[PDB]
Write a protein that binds this ligand. Structure first.
Ligand code: BCL
Ligand code: BCL
Ligand SMILES: CC[C@H]1c2cc3[nH]c4c(c3C)C(=O)[C@H](C(=O)OC)c4c3nc(cc4[nH]c(cc(n2)[C@@H]1C)c(C(C)=O)c4C)[C@@H](C)[C@@H]3CCC(=O)OC/C=C(\C)CCC[C@H](C)CCC[C@H](C)CCCC(C)C
Ligand SMILES: CC[C@H]1c2cc3[nH]c4c(c3C)C(=O)[C@H](C(=O)OC)c4c3nc(cc4[nH]c(cc(n2)[C@@H]1C)c(C(C)=O)c4C)[C@@H](C)[C@@H]3CCC(=O)OC/C=C(\C)CCC[C@H](C)CCC[C@H](C)CCCC(C)C
Ligand SMILES: COC1=C(OC)C(=O)C(C/C=C(\C)CC/C=C(\C)CC/C=C(\C)CC/C=C(/C)CC/C=C(\C)CC/C=C(\C)CC/C=C(\C)CC/C=C(\C)CC/C=C(\C)CCC=C(C)C)=C(C)C1=O
Ligand SMILES: COC(C)(C)C/C=C/C(C)=C/C=C/C(C)=C/C=C/C(C)=C/C=C/C=C(C)/C=C/C=C(\C)CC/C=C(\C)CCC=C(C)C
Ligand SMILES: COC(C)(C)C/C=C/C(C)=C/C=C/C(C)=C/C=C/C(C)=C/C=C/C=C(C)/C=C/C=C(\C)CC/C=C(\C)CCC=C(C)C
Ligand SMILES: COC(C)(C)C/C=C/C(C)=C/C=C/C(C)=C/C=C/C(C)=C/C=C/C=C(C)/C=C/C=C(\C)CC/C=C(\C)CCC=C(C)C
Ligand SMILES: COC(C)(C)C/C=C/C(C)=C/C=C/C(C)=C/C=C/C(C)=C/C=C/C=C(C)/C=C/C=C(\C)CC/C=C(\C)CCC=C(C)C
Ligand SMILES: COC(C)(C)C/C=C/C(C)=C/C=C/C(C)=C/C=C/C(C)=C/C=C\C=C(C)\C=C\C=C(/C)CC/C=C(\C)CCC=C(C)C
Ligand SMILES: CCCCCCCCCCCCO[C@@H]1O[C@H](CO)[C@@H](O[C@H]2O[C@H](CO)[C@@H](O)[C@H](O)[C@H]2O)[C@H](O)[C@H]1O
Ligand SMILES: CCCCCCCCCCCCO[C@@H]1O[C@H](CO)[C@@H](O[C@H]2O[C@H](CO)[C@@H](O)[C@H](O)[C@H]2O)[C@H](O)[C@H]1O
Ligand SMILES: CCCCCCCCCCCCO[C@@H]1O[C@H](CO)[C@@H](O[C@H]2O[C@H](CO)[C@@H](O)[C@H](O)[C@H]2O)[C@H](O)[C@H]1O
Lengths: 48, 306, 54, 281, 43, 54, 54, 54, 43, 43, 42, 51, 53, 54, 38, 42, 43
């Protein structure tokens, strides 16, 4: 399991979690989806 | 695991390559731009230079005018509201004039004249860009293959927007400049002409689109499967055939019973790609002008039960 | 207003001439088309009405 | 007969099943265990298609059709005349495609090359199974699959696409279409560029990968490189097929109404949902 | 400056003839504008 | 304006000639098309109706 | 104020000039079209109504 | 306080100046479009209402 | 000196022949426009 | 600083000519705005 | 100095940029005052 | 338990533990706020008649 | 204490970046949840309190 | 307390400054949009209602 | 992953776990006082 | 130290992080105290 | 500490200047908030 692979699985799961959280908190699924995608992309693009 | 050569595991960067010059006018050439590590994980991370000749600048200016004209009309449809503009962006449309104007230029600006202006802009831009591709092939002494491959798609585009409206006698037939407006134009075109599925040239165009996907999956997989023998360097495998070319040929020789060469597979590729738009343009041209109901036509020509 | 000539020392004459020609042509076509768009200025239809043409 | 360079590659080995029982070449074709399997399945499928033609009462190649069982049979069997021949031919077709892929795996092993080709073919096989196995079973009826006729399977396509309005509004459909169209564009560009480099203006020297990099940087200010273009072609085709199978796995299973209404969620975003003006205001 | 390095006399003559052409074009345009306004004014 | 000649020393003559030929053809066909589209100046229908052919 | 010469010691005159020309033209055409949109500022419409051309 | 002169030791004027220009132009056009959106501040229509031009 | 690698005398000859062609084309255009405007004016 | 290769004197004369052009453009724009505002004011 | 600018030229650049900023701000203040006179927004 | 830091990469272990704990905490907090019996905002709103 | 070992292993830059992003996301979460509740929409609290709407 | 400055040693001044600028401007835009959303605090609406403009 | 290094890391991790768990336990007791769930 | 930081460096970074955290904690405690005073939520 | 090559005095001066900017920004923010509360309190 490469560093990139672990970062990718973590990005997916953190995207799901923060998307759920901001979908409930933000009043719509779109806000949660956008926040999750943004944070996960910023996480996965950055290496270790 | 076993490496599959889909991403470069190690990147290397060196001097900025400014390219060659056979008959290139160095003056119009730009300077090397930045380097993209993310995009370099898939290919050449270098950006630029960009050649900006006389047909190139003409194309840039005309395309800027076309896109900007569509944008201004979209803002007008928004009530100049940025929030609406970002809400109804897909649903906007710079529609052509309604059929009662026919081919006449005497249409109100709000009633399709602006569409005529933007269409002129895009026409000029695309034709100057075709000239640009031909000239850039000319400067480096290369064949004009990219120019003709572009001319195929240009002909489909001209049929959709210019030639078919002229033949039908109304600008109302042409495609609007909208996101879902042109999707709806496509679906309505099929419904009006009676199941475009039974257009033989629509079927041929789909055959060659499916064939382009099949052929590029096959060629990409083949070249990646022999990239361990330097299969990527296709030009040198043409000039000096290696074990990569022979293994690639023999795979398909033993699979299908026949094979290509390192050069002729690209002849297959270019023809498979250009037949898509060639047959598509023919089929759109015949629709309405010659056949108004493709399913009844199919019935009369086999192709469908009576 | 007696010093503009040296722009020809910072601008390639071929590039600027082509840019000017393209710009003037596009602008002229756009204005002629706008005039044709307006029913009060389309000279073909104006002469059609004044001379009683179809 | 062999190519002028073939003999040094026609060596034993690489076969998954057997190893000398079915290790030979009939003409150019490599016959393996899976070669035998795929020949049997394909011959059976073709003969059964012809037999279904005579049961249908037509010999027009464009009128021959082999329909699946009706919606009433659910996911069960069917008489040969009703939907059974279609089920047998689906068995034969699946077997033939899988055997073809595994025969390609054997050929890859014997030539010491990568397995990109059988993998890319497995993508097409799974799209086919999405249309004939996954979607019907998730829907519960073999009658939701397509018939085996040249123009009747287009009738299946049209009826399914209009069961959900204008199918153009499926977004997975949109990304799949963008992938297909850009894949065709990429194929045109790649073929043209390589042919232009290998074939110069007239009676002058052949060009170099640097020359084609230069051409595409002078054209669009960029070049992806000769390894990158083949990567991109494989990715575009495989992802087009993937999102094709995706657009037809969520259709009639997750979304049931006209797909256009999907795009309402964006225009009803509360901040600008109720603003007057615009197309939808 | 001096990206082209054209000798100042050459730039002088180039600008002079370019302005000759520009003045010619603007004069023809002025004549046409006057004719159009007289035929059918917009003001 | 007696010195307009030296522009040939700035732009390639072949370039200018082919570009102006393409431009002339395009402008001519565009004007012909505009005139054909308008009913007043569509000469074919003028000769059809005026000579009572239609 | 009387010191803006130091912007051109770093910026390229050619790029700055071409970009500003394009921006000025785009702004001008955008404003002209804006005025043409509003019927209270559509000079062709206003002249058509004043002189009874419709 | 007035010691921010070292910010250009941190940021090149190359990127900073273009970013400032595009940002300020974008804010200007955004706010002008906002004002054009609200009928209470669309100056062309308010002038039409004052001068009875509709 | 220049860009196209030409002199002034050959430029003069080329300008002369191009101007002769332009005047001929414009004169044929003028004759055609007169014929049409007499046939069917647009003013 | 001095990225583009222009020097102080070149920058000064370039700025002088560009500002002359800017003032000319601004004066033409001012007179055009005054004419339009007289024809139809917006305030 | 991550662009090769010394203290003097950095100071001079900041002074001229600030002069430009204050010029822009003065023009904006005049515009805002004039608009608020024409149509106050409070 | 001592070999956990050896077989398992400590960076992975720490990141996974932190992310999982944060997600589980927000999930349980959302579950509480969903039900009308442990939603502190609604309960206090009904308590002081502030809604 | 004894927690300074957490700074012997993890890179401070990514730790600080993640901390900033997480804190902004959490603060946005809390403010958005509060404005979601009509009982704590301070804007509407003032609107009713000062008789605005 | 005083030992805050060393964060500048840890972090890139350029990247930190760009991130702070983009984050701050996005935050300001979001808050202004939030205020505009409620008719309670849409200052254009309040001013128009108070001054009888709509 | 030396045994001493891993053991010290384990000691620190267990100490932090106990601290966080005690804080959570105090929170749980305060919550039960606020309202019982069982 | 496999990340490059030594015991003195680690102690310095940890102490600075703790002091910043406690300053944030004082600000947050004041904020929650003010919010509770304005209206209790318990 | 490192990771950027800076010195102690460079970090101190960069932080002091940045804090001057931050305090100016926060003071303007306080003034604006007070003005808004006066014009229309949200509390
Ligand atoms: C309900 C709708 C109808 C239908 C209605 C139509 C209509 C109408 C058309 C097609 C056409 C096609 N259909 Mg169909 N089609 C249907 C069902 C299908 C199905 C299916 C599985 O059901 C498939 C695979 C297809 C596939 C196809 C393609 C083979 C073909 C499009 C070729 C192409 O790539 O043009 C894409 C390329 C272009 C259009 C030209 C673009 C190139 C030019 C130069 C653009 C310049 C770009 C510009 C300068 C800048 C771009 C902007 C920037 C990027 C922002 N159709 C159903 C039955 N179809 C087209 C065709 O030709 O077939 C006869 C066509 O007109
Ligand atoms: C009426 C009921 C009570 C209540 C019932 C409870 C109960 C029961 C509990 C809490 C707990 C908490 N409550 Mg409470 N709580 C209430 C409502 C709230 C509200 C609100 C909006 O009203 C807020 C903001 C909070 C906030 C909190 C937190 C202070 C605390 C959870 C800590 C945590 O999740 O760490 C997780 C987050 C992290 C660890 C961040 C680090 C992870 C990052 C994101 C990813 C890892 C990367 C990084 C490099 C890894 C390094 C470190 C690793 C750990 C190795 N509560 C009401 C008032 N609350 C919990 C607690 O007390 O914990 C001690 C708990 O058990
Ligand atoms: C064989 C048929 C297929 C095909 C082929 C094909 N397409 C082609 C070609 C070929 C062979 C080209 O050579 C040509 C090309 O250049 O490709 C890269 C092209 C092309 N196909 C394109 C698109 C395209 N092709 C499509 C389809 C297809 N093309 C078919 C599938 C489609 C679809 C499916 O709809 C699209 C959208 C373009 C990428 C390109 C033609 C570009 C062109 O003509 O551009 C003209 C410009 C405009 C009208 C608008 C420009 C908009 C800009 C924003 C203007 C401003 C620019 C800015 C000032 C730049 C600033 C830069 C500086 C900061 C440096
Ligand atoms: C996944 C990306 C694209 C792709 C890739 C791809 N295709 C591939 C491969 C790859 C990488 C191969 O290696 C393999 C090959 O050998 O290519 C020459 C192949 C192949 N793709 C083929 C076709 C094909 N690919 C298609 C599509 C695609 N292939 C994708 C777009 C299509 C479409 C879109 O319609 C077709 C028709 C073959 C040329 C070949 C596989 C040949 C094969 O399966 O061999 C064994 C079977 C036979 C020779 C005949 C079997 C006959 C049946 C038993 C009876 C008929 C049943 C069928 C259901 C009838 C239906 C008829 C109606 C639908 C009209
Ligand atoms: C750069 O690199 C590259 C190359 O080059 C270097 C390449 O080239 C290629 C390849 C690309 C091309 C050549 C371009 C053209 C390709 C396409 C347009 C793609 C689509 C292709 C086709 C439709 C072609 C036909 C495809 C198929 C599937 C037909 C295959 C044929 C058969 C089904 C026969 C299979 C036979 C088998 C398995 C043997 C079975 C044997 C037995 C059971 C026992 C013996 C039996 C017998 C004696 C029976 C009779 C004889 C036989 C077997 C056959 C003859 C008789 C028949 C009845 C059929 C690529 C991609 C490339 O990138
Ligand atoms: C929807 O919103 C609307 C449009 C309604 C309202 C929004 C309006 C907005 C946002 C407007 C923005 C306006 C702006 C930013 C305008 C800026 C205008 C400027 C700066 C114009 C400057 C023009 C300068 C010109 C035209 C200079 C021209 C110079 C020449 C022509 C001379 C050529 C130069 C030479 C010869 C240089 C010689 C020197 C050397 C060394 C060669
Ligand atoms: C939507 O908006 C609408 C359309 C409604 C309104 C908008 C209108 C707008 C924005 C209009 C903008 C108009 C502008 C900016 C017009 C500018 C026109 C200019 C600058 C024209 C300049 C023309 C110059 C010409 C024609 C020069 C011609 C010169 C020659 C023909 C001679 C060339 C030969 C030379 C110089 C010899 C050189 C040889 C040697 C050896 C040096
Ligand atoms: C629905 O229910 C919800 C989800 C809303 C309720 C749930 C709430 C939850 C899950 C809350 C969880 C809260 C938690 C776990 C909060 C943790 C907060 C922490 C750990 C805050 C720490 C802050 C520390 C800060 C801000 C430190 C700042 C440091 C400075 C300002 C100094 C800068 C110097 C640095 C960064 C390094 C110095 C450099 C050298 C070389 C020493
Ligand atoms: C969804 O939730 C809503 C929106 C409802 C409410 C939630 C709001 C939230 C979560 C708000 C969050 C707000 C935050 C975190 C605000 C933080 C603001 C801060 C700390 C801003 C700091 C700004 C600092 C600035 C602007 C400093 C600028 C510095 C200068 C202008 C001076 C130039 C600097 C130089 C020259 C560096 C010195 C370098 C040398 C070499 C001397
Ligand atoms: C903020 O936004 C700004 C304002 C800055 C810019 C944004 C602009 C935007 C958002 C633009 C959006 C553009 C879109 C979505 C365009 C969509 C275009 C589509 C989907 C086009 C699809 C098909 C178009 C076709 C096939 C057009 C074909 C046109 C021709 C073949 C040429 C037509 C030529 C004609 C009609 C005759 C021309 C000759 C004369 C004399 C008028
Ligand atoms: C994977 C990333 C995206 C995650 C998407 C997961 C599916 C949806 C998860 C959230 C589902 C519940 O999320 C919540 O639902 C309620 C349903 O009333 C909606 O909330 C809506 O009604 C509630 C009352 O019920 C109002 O208080 C609120 O003002 C309004 O926006 C929103 O949708 C969201 O606040
Ligand atoms: C290069 C292509 C341009 C040349 C095209 C030549 C044919 C042009 C179209 C035929 C002329 C227009 O034909 C006329 O159209 C108008 C509507 O516009 C209508 O006039 C009634 C009738 O349909 C027809 O009398
Ligand atoms: C490969 C084996 C596939 C078996 O799949 C099954 O095949 C038989 C033919 O063999 C089909 O149909 C046949 O048998 C079925 C079931 O015995 C009989 O009702 C029917 O008279 C006959 O047509 C089935 O409908 C199909 O489900």
């Amino acid at each position: 399991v490469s560093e990139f692979a672990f970062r990718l699985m973590m990005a997916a799961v953190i995207f799901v979690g923060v998307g759920i959280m901001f979908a409930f908190a933000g009043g719509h699924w779109f806000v949660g989806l956008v926040v999750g995608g943004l944070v996960a992309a910023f996480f996965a693009a950055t290496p270790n | 695991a076993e490496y599959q050569n889909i991403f470069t595991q190690v990147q290397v960067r060196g001097p900025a390559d400014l390219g060659m010059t056979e008959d290139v006018n160095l003056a119009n050439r730009s300077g090397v731009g930045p380097f993209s590590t993310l995009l370099g994980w898939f290919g050449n991370a270098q950006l630029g230079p960009i050649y900006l000749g006389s047909l190139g600048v003409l194309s840039l200016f005309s395309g800027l005018m076309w896109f900007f004209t569509i944008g201004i009309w979209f803002w007008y449809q928004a009530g100049w509201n940025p929030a609406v503009f970002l809400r109804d962006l897909f649903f906007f449309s710079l529609e052509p004039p309604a059929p009662e104007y026919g081919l006449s230029f005497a249409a109100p600006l709000k009633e399709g004249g602006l569409w005529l202006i933007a269409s002129f802009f895009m026409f000029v831009a695309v034709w100057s860009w075709w000239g640009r591709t031909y000239l850039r092939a000319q400067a480096l002494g290369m064949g004009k293959h990219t120019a003709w491959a572009f001319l195929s798609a240009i002909w489909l585009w001209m049929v959709l927007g210019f030639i078919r409206p002229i033949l039908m006698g109304s600008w109302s037939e042409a495609v609007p400049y909208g996101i879902f407006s042109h999707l709806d134009w496509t679906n309505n075109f099929s419904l009006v002409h009676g199941n475009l599925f039974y257009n033989p040239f629509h079927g041929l165009s789909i055959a060659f689109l499916y064939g382009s996907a099949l052929l590029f999956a096959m060629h990409g997989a083949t070249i990646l499967a022999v990239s361990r023998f330097g299969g990527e360097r296709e030009l040198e495998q043409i000039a000096d055939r290696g074990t990569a070319a022979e293994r690639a040929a023999l795979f398909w020789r033993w699979t299908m019973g026949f094979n290509a060469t390192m050069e002729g597979i690209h002849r297959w590729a270019i023809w498979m790609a250009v037949l898509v738009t060639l047959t598509g343009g023919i089929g759109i041209l015949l629709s309405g002008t010659v056949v108004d109901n493709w399913y009844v036509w199919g019935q009369n020509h086999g192709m469908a039960p009576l | 207003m007696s010093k503009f000539y040296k722009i020809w020392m910072i601008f390639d004459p071929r590039r600027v001439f082509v840019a000017q020609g393209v710009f003037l042509f596009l602008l002229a076509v756009m204005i002629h088309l706008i005039l044709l768009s307006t029913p009060s200025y389309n000279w073909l239809e104006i002469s059609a009405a004044k001379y009683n043409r179809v | 007969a062999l190519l002028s360079f073939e003999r040094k590659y026609r060596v034993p080995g690489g076969t998954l099943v057997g190893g000398n029982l079915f290790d030979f070449w009939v003409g150019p074709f490599y016959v393996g265990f899976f070669g035998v399997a795929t020949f049997f399945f394909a011959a059976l499928g073709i003969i059964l298609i012809a037999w279904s033609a005579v049961l249908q009462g037509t010999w027009n190649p464009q009128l021959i059709s082999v329909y699946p069982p009706a919606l009433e049979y659910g996911l069960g069997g069917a008489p040969l005349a009703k939907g059974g021949l279609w089920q047998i031919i689906t068995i034969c077709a699946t077997g033939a495609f899988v055997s073809w892929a595994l025969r390609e795996v054997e050929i890859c092993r014997k030539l010491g090359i990568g397995y990109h080709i059988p993998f890319a073919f497995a993508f097409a096989i799974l799209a086919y199974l999405t249309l004939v196995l996954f979607r019907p079973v998730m829907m519960g009826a073999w009658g939701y699959a397509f018939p085996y006729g040249i123009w009747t399977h287009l009738d299946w396509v049209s009826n399914t696409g209009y069961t959900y309005g204008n199918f153009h509004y499926n977004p997975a459909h949109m990304i799949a279409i963008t992938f297909f169209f850009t894949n065709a564009l990429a194929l045109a560009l790649h073929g043209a560029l390589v042919l232009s480099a290998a074939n110069p203006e007239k009676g002058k020297e052949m060009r170099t990968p640097d020359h084609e990099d230069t051409f595409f940087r002078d054209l669009v200010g960029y070049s992806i490189g000769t390894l990158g273009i083949h990567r991109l072609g494989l990715l575009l085709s495989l992802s087009a097929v993937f999102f094709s199978a995706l657009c037809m796995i969520i259709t009639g299973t997750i979304w049931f109404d006209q797909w256009v209404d999907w795009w309402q969620w964006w225009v009803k975003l509360p901040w600008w949902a109720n603003i007057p003006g615009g197309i939808n205001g | 400056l001096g990206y082209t390095g054209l000798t100042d006399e050459q730039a002088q003559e180039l600008h002079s003839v370019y302005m000759s052409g520009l003045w010619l074009f603007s004069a023809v345009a002025i004549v046409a504008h006057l004719a159009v306004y007289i035929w059918r004014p917009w003001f």
